[PDB]
């Protein structure tokens, strides 16, 4: 029979770097109905966002 004892100390020094590039499109919509005592309106909107 045999017994083994072991100790281990590890020093790990690590580097990392990164880039990233995002390209974002977007198409918005809107409708609106306004109403007052004697004033009524309506509105339609649309939006085109690049990024």
């Amino acid at each position: 029979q045999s017994t083994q004892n072991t100790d281990s100390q590890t020093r790990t020094i690590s580097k990392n770097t990164s880039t990233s590039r995002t390209h974002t499109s977007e198409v918005h919509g809107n409708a609106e109905v306004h109403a007052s005592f004697f004033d009524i309106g309506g509105s339609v909107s649309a939006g085109f966002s690049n990024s």
Partner: peptide, 23 residues
């Protein structure tokens, strides 16, 4: 100034819109 008052009431009849950021 009646015409100016009518223009002011017409301007009041609406919204100054909203401030939205999509950053």
């Amino acid at each position: 100034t009646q015409e100016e008052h009518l223009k002011e009431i017409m301007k009041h009849i609406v919204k100054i819109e909203v401030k939205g950021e999509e950053a």
